[PDB]
């Protein structure tokens, strides 16, 4: 048959309308079969976690000791390669204690069990796969439906329920590994016991489904409430009193208060996890009716919204003129209506902003701002074709509902046309050339009458959220997304940089200064933070509130009735909700209103639409409310979550300011139809949040657990394969290490995760060889191997670097330390040098090598789905990029720019970037790397992606078990690695390259003890002087010495150390003369200090980084480059 | 040649002031009639009718 | 060429007078627009 | 410079014609919007 | 001088376009209030 049960991870919401349709005698053939296998006790699909939580496996069913010894070997090689060798006795012991404890080990084996069954059952032409035993459970897989059984109890499920159970087990495996590796590296002891207690406590809650996810949703606000209640010193808060955890689950309550008693920081890290547990089944009828009711509710009167919208327009006008005077030193083109004040006239003619205007914004109701700029109606289509699912037209509504269910429910056929009858995505509309004339399509929005084919919106629930009634996002048609792109681009470009409250957020230096002043300020009794959360932010805005500011934007951008069509658009848009087997009724080809499944006409559109307007609108009433009570305020704003910084007044205690500020904000929130609740806002001076990072006493809270416990999308934009899974794991380790997670924890987690991700797919012949597993984790994508979290230098260092010296350093350390010969390295690397130089690969990546990478999958969308272009359509502008080869023109310009005799790949990659060629390759890259094209083009041509998966799996297994060697790399793996990378680049490319070779720091610089350093080593070194003796708690508290800038993990330790460049005897500080990148060297010295402190040692004397490789210091000159041949571009 | 050129120019400037003053009032009338028609259109199948005439 | 200036002047004064009377009828339109939006 | 002044006077005259048609349109609008109050 | 005539000529030309936009806009509002009479 066709492909079935395609997804390998949870991407869709968990709905149960199909199970209800199946259990009420459907006439579909697979429903009869699925109804047959159910037992006498059939549980509801909502209690699937009660049935999946009873799985127990026999102990030690999978032999994984080879993985343990291999992981110790890999980490010993890396720690020996950095020449930071106090770390390994903490590191391999941490990995061994992680994988030897049985409670962690059982969750590993359970992870491999679900991963193997997902590997077997997905993408199968077999409709019904027979009984598959997972421990003590039997599974029958009848198309989408899943039948589980233990003894006599059963549960009819969909396949997303099984994927949610698999992802829950995967998340717990990540959490149990990361907890051990993180807790090995504090002064504070291990905390695995509390994590196991939390697992048993949450698994011991025998409560109904809604109440259980009420407890699950509320764990992190309650823990934050306990921390805020115990650790507030000036303002008093009562946030913990709302929640029902002490009166429903006392066992969770005692655990959270004992973790609060031991460590405040630990409670936030443990309580931040919210996707390591099971996921709710969304009650579609009740949540749907509440959603369609929340789009039609009128909390305030129509006239009061219009009056307060005029009041918000006044302060918008005030901030725009303030920003224009602050930047361009003159007033904008404005019109003064009769009755204007004399101060406004005198300040307009003099071109000056007085301090007294900001407190009097009622005067700015007669100043009409004229045409500032014009509207760029043709936008960038980088963001047009990405991240959104888009319906073609109105008549595609019949394709989201089953015909048989509609036949039984309403008694007549759907009469759906069998063809797709529209573009599946935006680029499919680009093939047909609808988007060649963007103003001709935005013209019905401009006049004011949008077409009948564009007034439909489908509401899709959002996956992996903890709300039992669900959250919903808008799926719109073609024109309204282009409208949103033009509107948001216009506001972000011209409107927002003038407004100061937004301009401080969109500027890096001002935001850094504000967050740096906050951390020093809050601990010394000055300033406090007020947080507001809007539960109905996107559904609360109304047409009366937006229309004054929308009209003023129409006048400023000289676009007639353009921002004012979006407010009146919800009152004419048909709203249907996407859940098949519950279809809306159709009368004449159009949906019919019944209040639950269809709605003809709301008063708001949905979540994420018109965002930049509502952000300005949200800021306006807060500026009004806090200026009316005379407090110094700074507003940092991220959508529905607003955090407000309020400083001290000298007369009044801060509790009084908190009461008056909450009163003013609650007063001015009510007038816009957005009622804040007293049970969802806290005022604190110790705890705050900005940019998904929580801050306690001015120090960031470690977020290793949440980032590593997150399950990524996996096998990105392709058919399932090993390469993309390891690439997703490597990207997840790098993205976790970006946001202040320690590089050792991410590295030691990722080694074990990489090994288990191999063990799921690779046959038992490979995985019982220790030396092969040690080498295969140390090859990397640089020299033709697999993606690897170990081989990246971007983990330890922020900036981009040259990967080849690091790779040769690891592979050189492997031969000298571990008992591995060079024959196995030549077996796993398989270096196949191409006789033809491919300069295009060099300018797409300046450090790449002319090698053969056989593990990278075929793209198949690149320029190879071109068959639809020649048949479906005739004239379009995207076909100009597709039908002609820009690869041949790129190769031509590559041979043109290869003639530069002092060849610089960085300069070449610049000149392609400044040209039309690599720009067009970037456009073609945007079409292949986009959402809604991959899934839709994957759903068409169904069998090829599964057949390619089987072919690639057989190919990678036969390649990995092959023992044929490649190029002999013994001279490239001896001596210095800097010259080795140069000679290897000469071997692949044929010509020498100067400028892209960055020598690796531990190769370049050798840490030495201060008492035991040799004099020739002491002569050329960088001295790192501590001001006092440094111990474990110095990594938390910032020191007296100033921060340079480094990486953020050693920033606190950098404030206790003084470093200076004292190698001037050999090299006089090398400003633009030699190959020393100072940020890497100072970061490496601070990493030496960190490795000494965290391994049980102390630092008392100034330590030194001494030069070790003489050849690693080679000149960069004032070298002129001459491009010899004439350009044929 | 003072009175002709610059007093007639001042008259056209006063005319332009008065026209923008009228344009603001017509814009407020447009807001009220559009939001009233939009509130009428909720729950029915009333057509969308245009407000601004045509692009130049 | 003061004569054609006078000829255009006799009409350009009537332009401002017409603008004032259209402002008058715009406010008289605005009153019944507002009354309408007040009560429905 | 008489031709520019003459075509200027023609522009002022057609602007006066435009304001006369605008005034007639506003009177027709008021006759239309009187039906609001017997309607409700 | 010709150029000082040209400036005020452009200044008197643009308002004739503005009048036509206001007239057609207010006729569209006439159609809207006609549907409002039809509804009530
Ligand atoms: Zn070296």
PDB file of N, CA and C in Angstrom, chain C residues 1 4-5 8 11-12 14-16 18-19 21-22 25-26 28-29 31-36 40, chain D residues 1-2 5-6 8-9 12-16 19-20 22-23 26-27 29-30 33-34 36-37 40:
ATOM      1  N   UNK C   1       1.195  92.116 -15.493  1.00  0.00           N
ATOM      2  CA  UNK C   1       0.009  91.360 -15.875  1.00  0.00           C
ATOM      3  C   UNK C   1      -0.971  91.311 -14.705  1.00  0.00           C
ATOM      4  N   UNK C   4      -5.011  89.809 -15.110  1.00  0.00           N
ATOM      5  CA  UNK C   4      -5.336  88.392 -14.979  1.00  0.00           C
ATOM      6  C   UNK C   4      -5.153  87.924 -13.540  1.00  0.00           C
ATOM      7  N   UNK C   5      -4.254  88.586 -12.803  1.00  0.00           N
ATOM      8  CA  UNK C   5      -4.134  88.383 -11.361  1.00  0.00           C
ATOM      9  C   UNK C   5      -5.431  88.750 -10.652  1.00  0.00           C
ATOM     10  N   UNK C   8      -8.107  86.078 -11.470  1.00  0.00           N
ATOM     11  CA  UNK C   8      -7.984  84.876 -10.647  1.00  0.00           C
ATOM     12  C   UNK C   8      -8.255  85.179  -9.172  1.00  0.00           C
ATOM     13  N   UNK C  11     -11.900  84.861  -7.946  1.00  0.00           N
ATOM     14  CA  UNK C  11     -12.360  83.492  -7.729  1.00  0.00           C
ATOM     15  C   UNK C  11     -11.610  82.823  -6.576  1.00  0.00           C
ATOM     16  N   UNK C  12     -10.367  83.249  -6.309  1.00  0.00           N
ATOM     17  CA  UNK C  12      -9.586  82.558  -5.283  1.00  0.00           C
ATOM     18  C   UNK C  12     -10.069  82.970  -3.893  1.00  0.00           C
ATOM     19  N   UNK C  14     -13.343  83.313  -3.375  1.00  0.00           N
ATOM     20  CA  UNK C  14     -14.526  82.456  -3.321  1.00  0.00           C
ATOM     21  C   UNK C  14     -14.137  81.027  -2.952  1.00  0.00           C
ATOM     22  N   UNK C  15     -12.916  80.606  -3.320  1.00  0.00           N
ATOM     23  CA  UNK C  15     -12.431  79.289  -2.893  1.00  0.00           C
ATOM     24  C   UNK C  15     -12.349  79.164  -1.371  1.00  0.00           C
ATOM     25  N   UNK C  16     -11.774  80.163  -0.687  1.00  0.00           N
ATOM     26  CA  UNK C  16     -11.687  80.102   0.774  1.00  0.00           C
ATOM     27  C   UNK C  16     -13.057  80.221   1.430  1.00  0.00           C
ATOM     28  N   UNK C  18     -15.835  79.087   0.113  1.00  0.00           N
ATOM     29  CA  UNK C  18     -16.409  77.761  -0.088  1.00  0.00           C
ATOM     30  C   UNK C  18     -15.814  76.745   0.877  1.00  0.00           C
ATOM     31  N   UNK C  19     -14.510  76.844   1.155  1.00  0.00           N
ATOM     32  CA  UNK C  19     -13.889  75.958   2.141  1.00  0.00           C
ATOM     33  C   UNK C  19     -14.492  76.146   3.526  1.00  0.00           C
ATOM     34  N   UNK C  21     -17.601  77.214   4.203  1.00  0.00           N
ATOM     35  CA  UNK C  21     -18.968  76.689   4.278  1.00  0.00           C
ATOM     36  C   UNK C  21     -18.992  75.156   4.194  1.00  0.00           C
ATOM     37  N   UNK C  22     -17.995  74.545   3.539  1.00  0.00           N
ATOM     38  CA  UNK C  22     -17.920  73.085   3.586  1.00  0.00           C
ATOM     39  C   UNK C  22     -17.423  72.582   4.937  1.00  0.00           C
ATOM     40  N   UNK C  25     -20.730  72.551   6.897  1.00  0.00           N
ATOM     41  CA  UNK C  25     -21.575  71.382   6.655  1.00  0.00           C
ATOM     42  C   UNK C  25     -20.888  70.080   7.073  1.00  0.00           C
ATOM     43  N   UNK C  26     -19.551  70.062   7.180  1.00  0.00           N
ATOM     44  CA  UNK C  26     -18.879  68.874   7.705  1.00  0.00           C
ATOM     45  C   UNK C  26     -19.121  68.696   9.200  1.00  0.00           C
ATOM     46  N   UNK C  28     -21.817  69.874  10.746  1.00  0.00           N
ATOM     47  CA  UNK C  28     -23.228  69.489  10.831  1.00  0.00           C
ATOM     48  C   UNK C  28     -23.460  68.049  10.376  1.00  0.00           C
ATOM     49  N   UNK C  29     -22.555  67.500   9.563  1.00  0.00           N
ATOM     50  CA  UNK C  29     -22.632  66.074   9.264  1.00  0.00           C
ATOM     51  C   UNK C  29     -22.109  65.253  10.442  1.00  0.00           C
ATOM     52  N   UNK C  31     -22.135  65.826  13.633  1.00  0.00           N
ATOM     53  CA  UNK C  31     -23.034  65.713  14.786  1.00  0.00           C
ATOM     54  C   UNK C  31     -23.962  64.501  14.672  1.00  0.00           C
ATOM     55  N   UNK C  32     -24.585  64.312  13.506  1.00  0.00           N
ATOM     56  CA  UNK C  32     -25.497  63.184  13.345  1.00  0.00           C
ATOM     57  C   UNK C  32     -24.745  61.887  13.071  1.00  0.00           C
ATOM     58  N   UNK C  33     -23.476  61.974  12.665  1.00  0.00           N
ATOM     59  CA  UNK C  33     -22.640  60.772  12.670  1.00  0.00           C
ATOM     60  C   UNK C  33     -22.362  60.329  14.106  1.00  0.00           C
ATOM     61  N   UNK C  34     -22.005  61.278  14.965  1.00  0.00           N
ATOM     62  CA  UNK C  34     -21.690  60.949  16.356  1.00  0.00           C
ATOM     63  C   UNK C  34     -22.910  60.459  17.115  1.00  0.00           C
ATOM     64  N   UNK C  35     -24.020  61.178  17.002  1.00  0.00           N
ATOM     65  CA  UNK C  35     -25.249  60.771  17.671  1.00  0.00           C
ATOM     66  C   UNK C  35     -25.560  59.343  17.276  1.00  0.00           C
ATOM     67  N   UNK C  36     -25.392  59.041  15.998  1.00  0.00           N
ATOM     68  CA  UNK C  36     -25.642  57.687  15.506  1.00  0.00           C
ATOM     69  C   UNK C  36     -24.749  56.673  16.205  1.00  0.00           C
ATOM     70  N   UNK C  40     -27.299  52.724  19.473  1.00  0.00           N
ATOM     71  CA  UNK C  40     -27.685  51.773  18.435  1.00  0.00           C
ATOM     72  C   UNK C  40     -28.774  50.823  18.928  1.00  0.00           C
TER      73      UNK C  40
ATOM     74  N   UNK D   1       4.374  86.142 -19.406  1.00  0.00           N
ATOM     75  CA  UNK D   1       4.076  84.981 -18.574  1.00  0.00           C
ATOM     76  C   UNK D   1       2.567  84.776 -18.486  1.00  0.00           C
ATOM     77  N   UNK D   2       1.853  85.262 -19.506  1.00  0.00           N
ATOM     78  CA  UNK D   2       0.396  85.337 -19.433  1.00  0.00           C
ATOM     79  C   UNK D   2      -0.258  83.966 -19.584  1.00  0.00           C
ATOM     80  N   UNK D   5      -0.433  82.087 -16.295  1.00  0.00           N
ATOM     81  CA  UNK D   5      -1.436  82.705 -15.429  1.00  0.00           C
ATOM     82  C   UNK D   5      -2.845  82.332 -15.890  1.00  0.00           C
ATOM     83  N   UNK D   6      -3.045  82.237 -17.207  1.00  0.00           N
ATOM     84  CA  UNK D   6      -4.349  81.854 -17.746  1.00  0.00           C
ATOM     85  C   UNK D   6      -4.682  80.398 -17.421  1.00  0.00           C
ATOM     86  N   UNK D   8      -3.426  78.798 -14.979  1.00  0.00           N
ATOM     87  CA  UNK D   8      -3.612  78.846 -13.532  1.00  0.00           C
ATOM     88  C   UNK D   8      -5.048  79.190 -13.169  1.00  0.00           C
ATOM     89  N   UNK D   9      -5.612  80.201 -13.834  1.00  0.00           N
ATOM     90  CA  UNK D   9      -7.001  80.562 -13.594  1.00  0.00           C
ATOM     91  C   UNK D   9      -7.965  79.462 -13.996  1.00  0.00           C
ATOM     92  N   UNK D  12      -7.868  77.032 -11.111  1.00  0.00           N
ATOM     93  CA  UNK D  12      -8.675  77.558 -10.005  1.00  0.00           C
ATOM     94  C   UNK D  12     -10.167  77.399 -10.300  1.00  0.00           C
ATOM     95  N   UNK D  13     -10.560  77.579 -11.566  1.00  0.00           N
ATOM     96  CA  UNK D  13     -11.964  77.445 -11.947  1.00  0.00           C
ATOM     97  C   UNK D  13     -12.439  75.996 -11.840  1.00  0.00           C
ATOM     98  N   UNK D  14     -11.614  75.034 -12.270  1.00  0.00           N
ATOM     99  CA  UNK D  14     -12.051  73.644 -12.145  1.00  0.00           C
ATOM    100  C   UNK D  14     -11.978  73.164 -10.698  1.00  0.00           C
ATOM    101  N   UNK D  15     -11.107  73.755  -9.867  1.00  0.00           N
ATOM    102  CA  UNK D  15     -11.163  73.484  -8.430  1.00  0.00           C
ATOM    103  C   UNK D  15     -12.458  74.009  -7.813  1.00  0.00           C
ATOM    104  N   UNK D  16     -12.921  75.179  -8.270  1.00  0.00           N
ATOM    105  CA  UNK D  16     -14.206  75.706  -7.809  1.00  0.00           C
ATOM    106  C   UNK D  16     -15.364  74.807  -8.235  1.00  0.00           C
ATOM    107  N   UNK D  19     -15.330  71.858  -5.899  1.00  0.00           N
ATOM    108  CA  UNK D  19     -15.908  72.153  -4.588  1.00  0.00           C
ATOM    109  C   UNK D  19     -17.427  72.276  -4.659  1.00  0.00           C
ATOM    110  N   UNK D  20     -17.954  72.790  -5.777  1.00  0.00           N
ATOM    111  CA  UNK D  20     -19.407  72.841  -5.953  1.00  0.00           C
ATOM    112  C   UNK D  20     -20.016  71.441  -6.024  1.00  0.00           C
ATOM    113  N   UNK D  22     -18.647  68.794  -4.718  1.00  0.00           N
ATOM    114  CA  UNK D  22     -18.465  68.255  -3.371  1.00  0.00           C
ATOM    115  C   UNK D  22     -19.563  68.727  -2.423  1.00  0.00           C
ATOM    116  N   UNK D  23     -19.956  70.001  -2.530  1.00  0.00           N
ATOM    117  CA  UNK D  23     -21.023  70.539  -1.690  1.00  0.00           C
ATOM    118  C   UNK D  23     -22.365  69.891  -2.016  1.00  0.00           C
ATOM    119  N   UNK D  26     -22.305  66.437  -0.489  1.00  0.00           N
ATOM    120  CA  UNK D  26     -22.530  66.448   0.956  1.00  0.00           C
ATOM    121  C   UNK D  26     -23.990  66.722   1.307  1.00  0.00           C
ATOM    122  N   UNK D  27     -24.671  67.574   0.528  1.00  0.00           N
ATOM    123  CA  UNK D  27     -26.107  67.773   0.746  1.00  0.00           C
ATOM    124  C   UNK D  27     -26.899  66.496   0.462  1.00  0.00           C
ATOM    125  N   UNK D  29     -25.639  63.525   0.795  1.00  0.00           N
ATOM    126  CA  UNK D  29     -25.293  62.680   1.936  1.00  0.00           C
ATOM    127  C   UNK D  29     -26.162  62.972   3.150  1.00  0.00           C
ATOM    128  N   UNK D  30     -26.453  64.249   3.410  1.00  0.00           N
ATOM    129  CA  UNK D  30     -27.271  64.568   4.578  1.00  0.00           C
ATOM    130  C   UNK D  30     -28.711  64.116   4.374  1.00  0.00           C
ATOM    131  N   UNK D  33     -28.582  60.458   5.144  1.00  0.00           N
ATOM    132  CA  UNK D  33     -28.371  60.018   6.525  1.00  0.00           C
ATOM    133  C   UNK D  33     -29.486  60.494   7.448  1.00  0.00           C
ATOM    134  N   UNK D  34     -30.445  61.273   6.936  1.00  0.00           N
ATOM    135  CA  UNK D  34     -31.648  61.522   7.738  1.00  0.00           C
ATOM    136  C   UNK D  34     -32.527  60.277   7.901  1.00  0.00           C
ATOM    137  N   UNK D  36     -31.610  57.413   8.957  1.00  0.00           N
ATOM    138  CA  UNK D  36     -31.092  56.655  10.099  1.00  0.00           C
ATOM    139  C   UNK D  36     -32.048  56.654  11.283  1.00  0.00           C
ATOM    140  N   UNK D  37     -32.770  57.754  11.477  1.00  0.00           N
ATOM    141  CA  UNK D  37     -33.394  57.987  12.774  1.00  0.00           C
ATOM    142  C   UNK D  37     -34.852  57.555  12.750  1.00  0.00           C
ATOM    143  N   UNK D  40     -34.354  53.630  13.036  1.00  0.00           N
ATOM    144  CA  UNK D  40     -34.246  53.113  14.397  1.00  0.00           C
ATOM    145  C   UNK D  40     -35.350  53.676  15.287  1.00  0.00           C
TER     146      UNK D  40
END
